[PDB]
Design a protein around this nucleic acid. Structure first.
Length: 70
DNA sequence: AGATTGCAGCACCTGAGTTTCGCGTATGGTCACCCACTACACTACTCGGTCAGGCTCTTACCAGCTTAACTACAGTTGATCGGACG
């Protein structure tokens, strides 16, 4: 297909592979976020951001990646 | 596992935000024409002085006389004048 404007990505699965690629470990996070927040229209369950949640997802900013003070 | 049903994918008609546009309406700009005012040199008719022409008025008579005044001769006294003073 000549996928060149947003309207060419008509199929939902085609949109996700075109916008997010096929790295299996990356696609997990999208499935977790979808199930953990689809019903969260204006607010989300406290139980979903907790470190033990079945839907827990957390990406640390690059400044946190290793100790920087020294 | 079939009769009932939803998802959602395909295609084509459609709708607005956005744009480009045409005109109104009106405004500053070109430039062409012809007008007003000015003026140096000129055109030309009249007025004016001068002159002649020639018609015109007014004089004053000649010698004499006879009505009218001067116009000379003539004598003691002025006061500027010269030229020298203060």
């Amino acid at each position: 297909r000549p996928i060149r404007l947003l309207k060419d990505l008509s199929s939902a699965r085609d949109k996700i592979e075109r916008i997010y690629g096929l790295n299996k470990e990356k696609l997990l996070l999208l499935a977790k976020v979808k199930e953990g927040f689809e019903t969260s229209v204006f607010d989300f369950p406290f139980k979903n951001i907790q470190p033990d949640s079945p839907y827990f997802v957390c990406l640390d900013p690059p400044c946190k990646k290793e100790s920087a003070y020294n």
